[PDB]
Amino acid sequence: MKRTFQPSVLKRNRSHGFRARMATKNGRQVLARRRAKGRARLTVSK
Amino acid sequence: AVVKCKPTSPGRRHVVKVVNPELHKGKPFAPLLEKNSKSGGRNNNGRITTRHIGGGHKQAYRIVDFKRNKDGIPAVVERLEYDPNRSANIALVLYKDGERRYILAPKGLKAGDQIQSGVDAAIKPGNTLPMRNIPVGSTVHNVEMKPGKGGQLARSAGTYVQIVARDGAYVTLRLRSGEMRKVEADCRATLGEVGNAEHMLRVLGKAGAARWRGVRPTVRGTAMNPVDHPHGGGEGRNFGKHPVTPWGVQTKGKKTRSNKRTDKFIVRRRS
Amino acid sequence: MIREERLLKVLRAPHVSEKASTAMEKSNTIVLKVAKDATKAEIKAAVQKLFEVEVEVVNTLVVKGKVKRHGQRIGRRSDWKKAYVTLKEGQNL
RNA sequence: GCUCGCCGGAAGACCAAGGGUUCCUGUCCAACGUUAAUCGGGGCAGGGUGAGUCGACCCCUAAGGCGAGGCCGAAAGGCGUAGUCGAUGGGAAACAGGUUAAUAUUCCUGUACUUGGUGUUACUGCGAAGGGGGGACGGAGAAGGCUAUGUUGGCCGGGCGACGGUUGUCCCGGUUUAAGCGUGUAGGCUGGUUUUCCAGGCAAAUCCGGAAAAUCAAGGCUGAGGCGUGAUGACGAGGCACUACGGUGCUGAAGCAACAAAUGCCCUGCUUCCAGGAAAAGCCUCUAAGCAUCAGGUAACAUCAAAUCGUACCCCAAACCGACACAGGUGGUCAGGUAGAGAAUACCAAGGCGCUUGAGAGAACUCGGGUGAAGGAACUAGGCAAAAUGGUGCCGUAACUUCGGGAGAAGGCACGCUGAUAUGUAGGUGAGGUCCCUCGCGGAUGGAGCUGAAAUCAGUCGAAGAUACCAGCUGGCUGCAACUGUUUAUUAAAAACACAGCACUGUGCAAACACGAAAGUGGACGUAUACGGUGUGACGCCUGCCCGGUGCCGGAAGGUUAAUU
RNA sequence: AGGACCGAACCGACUAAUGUUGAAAAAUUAGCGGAUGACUUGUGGCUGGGGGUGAAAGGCCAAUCAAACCGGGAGAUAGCU
Ligand SMILES: [Mg+2]
Ligand SMILES: [Mg+2]
Ligand SMILES: [Mg+2]
Ligand SMILES: [Mg+2]
Ligand SMILES: [Mg+2]
Ligand SMILES: [Mg+2]
Ligand SMILES: [Mg+2]
Ligand SMILES: [Mg+2]
Ligand SMILES: [Mg+2]
Ligand SMILES: [Mg+2]
Ligand SMILES: [Mg+2]
Ligand SMILES: [Mg+2]
Ligand SMILES: [Mg+2]
Ligand SMILES: [Mg+2]
Ligand SMILES: [Mg+2]
Ligand SMILES: [Mg+2]
Ligand SMILES: [Mg+2]
Ligand SMILES: [Mg+2]
Ligand SMILES: [Mg+2]
Ligand SMILES: [Mg+2]
Ligand SMILES: [Mg+2]
Ligand SMILES: [Mg+2]
Ligand SMILES: [Mg+2]
Ligand SMILES: [Mg+2]
Ligand SMILES: [Mg+2]
Ligand SMILES: [Mg+2]
Ligand SMILES: [Mg+2]
Ligand SMILES: [Mg+2]
Ligand SMILES: [Mg+2]
Ligand SMILES: [Mg+2]
Ligand SMILES: [Mg+2]
Ligand SMILES: [Mg+2]
Ligand SMILES: [Mg+2]
Ligand SMILES: [Mg+2]
Ligand SMILES: [Mg+2]
Ligand SMILES: [Mg+2]
Ligand SMILES: [Mg+2]
Ligand SMILES: [Mg+2]
Ligand SMILES: [Mg+2]
Ligand SMILES: [Mg+2]
Ligand SMILES: [Mg+2]
Ligand SMILES: [Mg+2]
Ligand SMILES: [Mg+2]
Ligand SMILES: [Mg+2]
Ligand SMILES: [Mg+2]
Ligand SMILES: [Mg+2]
Ligand SMILES: [Mg+2]
Ligand SMILES: [Mg+2]
Ligand SMILES: [Mg+2]
Ligand SMILES: [Mg+2]
Ligand SMILES: [Mg+2]
């Protein structure tokens, strides 16, 4: 039947994209934690 | 006219329509139109603050002249119109200088009638003047609360106010609620009653009809679980509560007015 | 509009294939690898100065580089710009 | 390669979203593929996506987001003004044919169109972040005109039949042609022009709005399709040469009419209703600051420019969401023939497939079906499941009823084919010829040709004519809920929730109430015929007694009583 | 005209059989209800955890919601096994 993941790149980027993370203090904290962990991909990008 | 529908279907049997043939057919006067934004009863935090608001037909806003400040310049009523934003009808009025405005349509006002505002205006229906110049005992509508602020009282269909006294810089009004209220005599009021008194004679007849008006269903607190409303649960139909609001506040009887700042203007409260 | 230093860096390589050979024989069109950032105006001017031939029209596309999996890790070839440079009726080179 | 079978409002084709090379060619087969695999969406290599006019970007805004200053908040932050972003909506312009192994409205051929820059020439009041117009708007319904498309005839090419007949009232196939340009039709809307005056359109206006005269009855605006051109062309069965037998080159007949006909178009129309139906820019016009032999505006011709990114392939699925090559899920577009009311259904066309283990056998038992003597609910918790009914027309139809209903109540009759009325009727459509004319895509007359249901009478075949697929079972008593709706996604659809209606109660607007330490906001650009809370639940006939208790409302004399002093 | 009637698409989910190490972590087949409306659906937006939203079933809030998920206090505590 209809599953929970229904893709949309616009909604993906608006909700979880780099700029969305940079827009709030807590989102810049997500990027900082991920950078300290040494993550290859900080966000889903192009 | 108030019209009953034949029972050709169950949701039609109890319908009682208010059909007014005097009202303009079609579109309103475009220059006096603004866009209306539907809320769903949600505020700037996106939370429902007023329940049961949602859906219902799209409506354009008509700029209504509640101030009636265009003094000395006479005007003719061009047509009466339906306004989805209020119970009352509106009148498209043409001033001698070429300006057009919308006004609340008083009882009896028709196309061709001549209206005017100002301290000197004639005592006739549709005319606006400060209440210091309107005789005591007169029936008025679209009453200002502060001078020049605009009409705030007796705006709904069939409503009116009676100037029962004048003393000093103030008038005493018998509001439609039955309240005796003091307002300063320099506040304007329009002669007559608001028209469309047959409005209260309508019977929606079905659930869909309140829905077209943007009214969403009311769930009885007793129909809920304890966690949702103080009117809680029970095994079968149970009450045994002192009736309250969803927030645990005494509904039925408890007075909620708390305005020491405006107390001085209330002569006698409603009954 | 142009500069020699820029025109000298804009044309990268002739592109060889069956499509490129048939484009030359049938339509007098040369198929090239051009700088990724190269514009149709730059490719026209560069071909005219360096190849000394008259250009009719430049058509361009971006080729996406293919991905190859090496077990758990991926490799990616580079995206590049292809130019279909049509020369006027009088053919040279 | 020849057959056979399946789908065909899809199991075909095309978009979007999402994926990302899966696309095409060569080569390979370990692993992947529920089997073998020489094959593959698998491995490896190479190739492949070509735009001024298709989309994005771009200009414009919607909900909503962000937001200089600002307002507010221990800090973090919240809100918000000017603004600035944000499509799922508005805004310039391209079509037909050919081509590749794989792209094409992108390449090529043919024929076009849009908006800017520059130049020349003739004419000229130009100018905005502003004004006005416009853009620009709902539901339902009606029926006329069309086209897409089909059918038949004609026309042209081919045929003369594996077995009785087949030179004819015979068979098969084709009969296709765009945008653009010209014409301004069926039809929709609206009276037109000039002059003068003006408390309105933040300032101005020659524009809009308002006022008053004069004059003419025809003026304009919108508009499908047709017709012409485009087209001297393209496409076109087939013929003739070469073939690496995959194909390639050359050549090329007819290309018309009548009738039927959308759910597409005229139509953002018309009619009608109440629930009363975005914005902003492009665009047209008007002026302000300003420039006033300049610049700028209008037109013709010439010339230049139109960048950048996307474009392969899958797409109702083996490529997307489902761990799988998974009977699941996934928005939009197109709509051929016969029968049919139909987009149902059956058979087919174009097109796509036989679903990636097969071979035998013909036990019990399980699954899914077909038929069944006599009986006919005896079964069982219960007719669960089956079986049955099933179409159109006409006749006919009870209690009760809120007069709508109940009703398709129930029950009955007819039903194929052939001929006659009439070698094809009623009707629909409509050519020639004649005549008029403000000569047109015109009007009247005229009825050829075409198409064409239904009825009666007579006859005829079968057991059976709504023959298949498809397609109501009907009736009586009674509980509950008025009704249509809603609900426990995944054991409950109900008598539960909601509902129109009724009542109580709060609320005078900076409303009560609600989200918020606040600012701000919803209620509401509403105003007591309004808004909130609570209960009851259409309608009919009605709703009695009790204020001791608990809750609430009102009271101020006395008693008791906080900080404070 | 109608929250009108019959009936595809579309939306739903009343009954039964099958399936229950499924073809499927809720389906398939035969029947069933709504089908101009309180209808249905695409794209985007807003509401956030004692919070939302709820025609109210404690329903739903990314496959177990009478208090989501993740990380942390954390080696909570466990007179129990
Ligand atoms: Mg309950
Ligand atoms: Mg209490
Ligand atoms: Mg080109
Ligand atoms: Mg390109
Ligand atoms: Mg690959
Ligand atoms: Mg392939
Ligand atoms: Mg194998
Ligand atoms: Mg491969
Ligand atoms: Mg700031
Ligand atoms: Mg803000
Ligand atoms: Mg913008
Ligand atoms: Mg868009
Ligand atoms: Mg292709
Ligand atoms: Mg010029
Ligand atoms: Mg404007
Ligand atoms: Mg309308
Ligand atoms: Mg036709
Ligand atoms: Mg023979
Ligand atoms: Mg006409
Ligand atoms: Mg040929
Ligand atoms: Mg393609
Ligand atoms: Mg496709
Ligand atoms: Mg398979
Ligand atoms: Mg599948
Ligand atoms: Mg679907
Ligand atoms: Mg079918
Ligand atoms: Mg299989
Ligand atoms: Mg067997
Ligand atoms: Mg038997
Ligand atoms: Mg028998
Ligand atoms: Mg019997
Ligand atoms: Mg028995
Ligand atoms: Mg028994
Ligand atoms: Mg049964
Ligand atoms: Mg059966
Ligand atoms: Mg007979
Ligand atoms: Mg009983
Ligand atoms: Mg019910
Ligand atoms: Mg129901
Ligand atoms: Mg359930
Ligand atoms: Mg159920
Ligand atoms: Mg009740
Ligand atoms: Mg009582
Ligand atoms: Mg008291
Ligand atoms: Mg209905
Ligand atoms: Mg089913
Ligand atoms: Mg039924
Ligand atoms: Mg139905
Ligand atoms: Mg959504
Ligand atoms: Mg601790
Ligand atoms: Mg532990």
Distance between CA atoms of residues C54 and B135, nearest Å: 96
In whole angstroms, give the CA distance from residue B114 to residue B194.
17
d(CA B156, CA B47): 29
Q: Tell me the C-alpha to C-alpha distance, in Å, between residue B14 and each of A45, B17, B193.
A: 60, 10, 29
Structure tokens at C78: 């580079």
* Conformation bin of residue B16: beta by default, left when phi > 0, alpha when psi is -120 to 50: beta
The secondary structure of B129-192 as a DSSP string is EEGGGS-TT-EEESEESSTTS-EEES-STT--EEEEEEETTEEEEE-TTS-EEEEETTSEEEES
- How many Cα atoms within 13 Å fall on the side-chain side of residue C61? 5
Query: In this structure, are residues B5 and B13 in contact, taking their beta carbons and an 8 Å threshold?
Result: yes
Q: Which nucleotides of E are covered by protein (CB under 7 A)?
A: 1-4, 26-27, 37-39, 43-48, 52-58, 62-63, 66-67
User: Which conformational region is residue B137 in: left (phi greater than 0), alpha (psi within -120 to 50 degrees), or beta?
Assistant: left
In the numeric block, the tokens 């300063």 are attached to B184
Dig out the tokens for B148 from the structure: 């020049």
In chain C the domains, ranked by start, together with CATH numbers, are 1-93 (3.30.70.330)
Buried b / exposed e over B121-147, threshold 16 CB at 10 Å, is beeebbbbbbbeebeeebbbbbbbeee
Separation between Cα atoms, residue C12 and residue B160, nearest integer Å: 87
User: Phi then psi for B226, rounded to 5 degrees?
Assistant: -45, -40
B77 within 8 A of B88, measured Cβ to Cβ: no
What is the three-class DSSP state of B3?
Answer: strand
CA A9 to each of CA A27, A39, A44, B45: distance values in angstroms, whole numbers, following the listed order: 19, 21, 10, 27
Distance A4 CA to ligand 27 centre (A): 30
CA atoms within 13 A on the CB side of C54: 5
Which value in Å is the resolution of this experimental model?
Answer: 3.0
What is the amino acid identity at position B134?
I
* CATH number, span A1-46: 1.10.287.3980
Q: Which residues contact C48 (CB under 8 A, 6 or more apart)?
A: C54, C55
Gap from C90 CA to D243 C1', Å:
34
Q: Residue C43: which residues within 8 A CB-CB, separation 6 or more? A: C10, C11, C32, C34, C58, C60, C83, C85
Q: Which residues pair with B153 in a beta bridge?
A: B143
Separation between Cα atoms, residue B200 and residue B81, nearest integer Å? 19
Q: How many CA atoms lie within 13 A of B195 on its CB side?
A: 22
Fill in the amino acid letter for B52: H
Provide the CA B8 to C1' D261 distance, Å, integer. 37
Q: How many residues does chain B have?
A: 271
Give the whole-angstrom CA distance, residue B65 versus residue B128.
11
The whole-angstrom distance between residue B67's C-alpha and the CA centroid of its chain comes to 16
Neighbours of chain A (3+ CB pairs under 8 A): none
Locate the domains of chain A by residue range. Answer: 1-46
Q: How was this structure determined?
A: X-ray
Q: Specify the amino acid at residue A26.
A: N
Query: Helix, strand, or coil here: B104?
Result: strand
Distance CA A20, CA C59 (A): 38
Backbone discontinuities in chain A, residue before each (C to N > 2.5 A):
none
Q: How far apart are CA A13 and CA A18, in angstroms?
A: 8
The neighbours of chain C, by the rule of 3 or more Cβ pairs under 8 Å, are none
Q: Which residues, other chains included, contact B65 with Cβ-Cβ below 8 Å and sequence gap of 6+?
A: B101, B102, B103
How far is Cα B189 from Cα B169, in angstroms, rounded to an integer?
A: 15
Phi/psi at C5 (5° precision): -50, -45
Helix (H) / strand (E) element for C61: namely strand C55-63
- Chain D positions with an atom below 7 A of a protein C-beta are 17-21, 43-51, 62-66, 76-80, 87, 100-102, 106-108, 132-134, 136-138, 198-200, 209-210, 273-279, 306-311, 320-322, 328-330, 402-404, 482-484, 489, 496-501, 504-516, 520-539, 550-554
> Which chains neighbour B (Cβ–Cβ under 8 Å, 3 or more pairs)?
none
How far is residue B208's CA from residue B213's CA, in Å, rounded to a whole number? 9
Half-sphere exposure of B132 (CA within 13 A, CB side): 12
Cα of B24 from ligand 19 centre, angstroms: 30
Nucleotide nearest to B4 (CA to C1'): E1
- Is residue B144 within 8 A of residue B150, CB to CB? The reply is yes
Contact indicator for C2, C25 with CB cutoff of 8 Å: no
Pairing, β B151-153 against β B143-144:
antiparallel
Per-residue flag: A12 CB under 7 A of strand E: no
Longest dimension (CA), chain A: 40
Enumerate the H helices of chain B as residue ranges. 207-211
